[PDB]
Amino acid sequence: AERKTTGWAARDPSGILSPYTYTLRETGPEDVNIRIICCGICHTDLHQTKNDLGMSNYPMVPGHEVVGEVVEVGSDVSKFTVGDIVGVGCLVGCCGGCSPCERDLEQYCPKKIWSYNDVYINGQPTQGGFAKATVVHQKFVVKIPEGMAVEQAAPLLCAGVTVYSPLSHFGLKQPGLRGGILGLGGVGHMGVKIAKAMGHHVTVISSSNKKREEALQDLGADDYVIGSDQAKMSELADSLDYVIDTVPVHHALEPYLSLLKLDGKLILMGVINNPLQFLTPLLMLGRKVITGSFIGSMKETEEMLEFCKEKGLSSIIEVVKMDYVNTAFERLEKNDVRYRFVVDVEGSNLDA
Ligand SMILES: NC(=O)c1ccc[n+]([C@@H]2O[C@H](COP(=O)([O-])OP(=O)(O)OC[C@H]3O[C@@H](n4cnc5c(N)ncnc54)[C@H](OP(=O)(O)O)[C@@H]3O)[C@@H](O)[C@H]2O)c1
Ligand SMILES: [Zn+2]
Ligand SMILES: [Zn+2]
């Protein structure tokens, strides 16, 4: 009992998204009721949607990069008022007293609910951003800058911040630094963008030679080297201050750790089921660090956006309507996209 929406949704293993109508919760007293103007896609949306864990809980509505005007607000809600273009991240909830989120790192809290494939504090499966509206916690929605486009603010709610708060916690956003972005796409792309926008010497590393166009002449990278090329990578001996990782599966790390000078950082992002490996020696050569980052806290989701505003950042997004999502996903598998996708839920949703 809340108020009824509609919205596209998967149902079995092979993620074919049907239409789907469902009863929301109600916006009280710390909920924000939003009308979703545009959502967005990335590989997280397929990998939930397919299982790729053997964990997917159907009926499943994808959508964690959302942006759109707020139609209703709580009783204690104060921050936002109606009619604000507001956006919301991956997280929808979390508890309240665990000191992980006394000091604002609320993503590193055990009791976090996600946008979809979770179960909220009331019981309803959290359903995504592929539905023409939703109800979030007022603590898990960030407001939006004056001029930041609704297509442009969306990807940054998960891939834009994913990479920002590594380049913020490990020291890295004070200027100068050399960095090598490994795996140019999604999470690689915003890496190149925000690190080179911080006045850093960014090198792209790659499986292929192919993403050379969307790097040197499009992203603004200072170099491009193949991971599997020993002679060009050896020139980059103890070069970079950090190396980030968008590569999605079991790759060997000591290749990628060579490219690091004294006190360098390997910051792994991707969900890599299977243990990764290292020689305790190399790390002892240069006092080198291996760690992983998980998206961003809302204060740095607040920050990242107003940062992407000031240093005016962008990406080529192919805005598609809602009746083109499974074709957008097949294209996302043949990784065509046109550097990014945004689903503007200003299309096909009505009933059933
Ligand atoms: N905070 C987090 O922990 C976080 C945040 C967002 C997403 N993720 C997850 O991490 C993954 C990646 O991010 P994304 O979804 O935005 O898209 P994505 O990085 O564009 O996905 C593929 C990219 O990784 C590279 N790649 C693939 N296989 C590789 C290999 N074997 N060796 C080297 N490079 C390889 C490809 O570039 P090349 O062909 O040029 O090598 C390609 O650009 C996803 O599974 C996503 O769900 C984690
Ligand atoms: Zn995402
Ligand atoms: Zn907590």
Domain segments of the chain as ranges: 1-158+316-352, 159-315
Beta bridge partners of 133: 35
Q: Whose CA is nearest to atom 36 of ligand 1?
A: 183
- For the CA of 292, the nearest atom of ligand 1: 3
Residue numbering of the annotated binding site for Zn(2+): 42, 64-65, 95, 98, 101, 109, 158
Ligand nearest to the CA of 211: 1
- For the CA of 163, the nearest atom of ligand 1: 1
Residue 199 φ/ψ region, left for φ over 0, alpha for ψ in the -120 to 50 degree band, beta for the rest:
left
Question: For residues 148 and 307, is the Cβ–Cβ distance under 8 A?
Answer: no
For residues 176 and 183, give the distance between their C-alpha atoms in angstroms, rounded to a whole number.
Answer: 22
Q: Whose CA is nearest to atom 37 of ligand 1?
A: 183
> Residue 127: which of 18, 52, 43 has the closest Cα?
18
> Residue 275: which of 294, 293, 259, 253 has the closest Cα?
253
Calculate the alpha carbon distances from 197 to 163, 164, 175, 220, 329 in Å. Answer: 13, 11, 10, 9, 30
The tokens describing 135, both together, are 């109800």
For residues 49 and 62, give the distance between their C-alpha atoms in angstroms, rounded to a whole number.
Answer: 7
Q: Whose CA is nearest to atom 9 of ligand 1?
A: 270
For residues 291 and 244, give the distance between their C-alpha atoms in angstroms, rounded to a whole number.
Answer: 10
Q: What CATH number should be reported for the domain whose range is 1-158+316-352?
A: 3.90.180.10
For residues 194 and 203, give the distance between their C-alpha atoms in angstroms, rounded to a whole number.
Answer: 13
The H helix count followed by the E strand count for the chain is 9, 19
| Residue 100: partners with Cβ closer than 8 Å, 6 or more residues away | 106, 108, 109
| Ligand 1 pocket mutation, candidates 108, 187, 272, criterion most atoms within 8 A of CB | 187
The top-level CATH class assigned to 159-315 is alpha beta
Solving technique: X-ray
> Residue 200: which of 224, 220, 228, 230 has the closest Cα?
220
Q: Determine the distance separating the centroid of ligand 2 and the alpha carbon of 162, expressed in angstroms.
A: 9
For residues 294 and 64, give the distance between their C-alpha atoms in angstroms, rounded to a whole number.
Answer: 15
Q: Which residues line ligand 1 (CB under 6 A)?
A: 42-44, 47, 158-159, 162, 183-188, 206-208, 211, 227, 246-248, 251, 269-271, 293-295
The tokens describing 108, both together, are 């590193």
* CA-CA-CA-CA torsion sign (115, 309, 347, 333): negative
Q: Determine the distance separating the centroid of ligand 2 and the alpha carbon of 159, expressed in angstroms.
A: 6
Calculate the alpha carbon distances from 317 to 151, 215, 325, 344 in Å. Answer: 8, 16, 14, 11
Q: Where are the alpha helices (DSSP H) in 198-324?
A: 230-233, 253-257, 280-286, 298-310
Residue numbering of the annotated binding site for NADP(+): 44, 162, 183-188, 206-211, 246, 270, 293-295
The most distant pair of C-alpha atoms in the chain lies apart, rounded to whole Å, by 64
| Residue 114: partners with Cβ closer than 8 Å, 6 or more residues away | 64, 90, 91, 92, 126
